[PDB]
Design a protein around this ligand. Sequence first.
Ligand SMILES: Nc1cc(-n2ccnc2)c2cc(F)cc(O)c2n1
Length: 124
Amino acid sequence: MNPPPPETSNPNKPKRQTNQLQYLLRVVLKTLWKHQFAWPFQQPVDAVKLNLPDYYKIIKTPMDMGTIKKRLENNYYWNAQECIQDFNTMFTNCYIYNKPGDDIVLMAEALEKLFLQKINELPT
Ligand SMILES: Nc1cc(-n2ccnc2)c2cc(F)cc(O)c2n1
């Protein structure tokens, strides 16, 4: 079975919109989304379909760009740093589950370097 996906809304959690968060959706996510290596990260890992039955035995804080995108569209975050942490969790989980040089890891590393370039400068 797959676990329930991470929440994309939470009425207990305060919402906010900042220039930097609009930018993380408008520019950073929506450009990463178009990368040729983006597709494995556009939705939660379906460990049933991919025959990775050990995935959620190892990965306990799963994160993906589909969840991030919905969070950004919902103004789920308080600030840009909260969103950047979700990106880092997504990359870090892929390096934890897989090994250096794996095809998926090369994909994650391409996106990560592009992500780092894009958030080097955020709007004021
Ligand atoms: N062994 C794998 C396979 C993945 N995948 C998913 C679709 N096609 C390959 C995968 C995807 C991720 F977003 C993170 C990972 O850690 C992954 N690990």
